[PDB]
Design a protein around this ligand. Structure first.
Ligand SMILES: [Mg+2]
Ligand SMILES: [Mg+2]
Lengths: 180, 180
């Protein structure tokens, strides 16, 4: 099996099947970056990352098929699938991908993504008088993600993100009541 | 006519009729703040601000009615309506309200509002390879608003906003391609 080629194929396959594709390719780039400092089977990581968002049980069986057809030892297929499960006792590969996923939920992308999501489920931006307001989602989940990360590399590439997010929030609650 | 009371009534009427109510009350608070430094008929401003978002020709005729019923000289009704038109040769009152409206389109609120809007019209967050991406809306309109403002007071209460917005954008385009 030619790893470089298989990756390329998987990449082109997911692309012509798509949040959007932009999201996947980010989790892919992100997990790639993380491994270069946390180690692990890069090939096993790169695919789990690219397929982490396809399972939404036939879909799963479809991937296995596509993978057996590529002649990937059934041992790798097993790991790759096990990883996808811990995403959407953890091996580093399962940690990396899961970290790369969470990382794309916070920071500037997080803000944009979470507010775009709210705009498709009628979730009030905020509400001083906060049970389901998007703003509260930042205090309940988002802001907490940065710490739940299970990788130091992931944690440092989360720093700049956890910052702008913090600044964004401060600025929101401030101009959300008009203070001056 | 009791101005303080009429304002209260208009306030309670728009409230039980609602972007959401949060938006109107902000444009109201915002225009109030601005006038305290730019002058103008506060009463004429306060109502145009509260009704600036109701015209969406019967609606217009409904307001006039509600206003004549409050015994507001037909001269004020005229101005108040003229203002609402320049919002959704400009007197300062028309400038203030229009400034207060634009102000709520940028800054943290802007980001949140524009991304929530995109999430209800399927507007891709961004796209490096930008004709309709929400990101581009920042370069085409939003970022430009801060300068189109026709009031110095408005311009300074736009400073903090134009900043976080600038920071947010920088941070977006940066983590949108994963740079490190
Ligand atoms: Mg995902
Ligand atoms: Mg408005």
């Amino acid at each position: 099996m030619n790893k470089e080629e298989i990756i390329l194929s998987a990449k082109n396959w997911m692309h012509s099947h798509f949040h959007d594709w932009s999201h996947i390719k980010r989790v892919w780039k992100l997990s790639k970056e993380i491994q270069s400092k946390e180690g692990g089977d890069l090939f096993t990581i790169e695919l789990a990352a690219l397929f982490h968002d396809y399972s939404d049980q036939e879909a799963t069986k479809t991937l296995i098929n596509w993978m057996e057809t590529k002649e990937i030892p059934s041992e790798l297929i097993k790991k790759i699938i096990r990883i996808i499960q811990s995403v959407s006792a953890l091996t580093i590969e399962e940690k990396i991908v899961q970290d790369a996923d969470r990382l794309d939920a916070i920071g500037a992308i997080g803000i944009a993504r979470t507010f775009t999501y709210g705009g498709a489920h009628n979730r009030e931006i905020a509400n001083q008088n906060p049970k389901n307001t998007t703003l509260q989602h930042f205090y309940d989940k988002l802001l907490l993600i940065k710490d739940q990360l299970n990788t130091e590399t992931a944690k440092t590439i989360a720093k700049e993100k956890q910052k702008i997010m913090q600044d964004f929030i401060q600025a929101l609650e401030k101009e959300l009541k008009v203070l001056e």
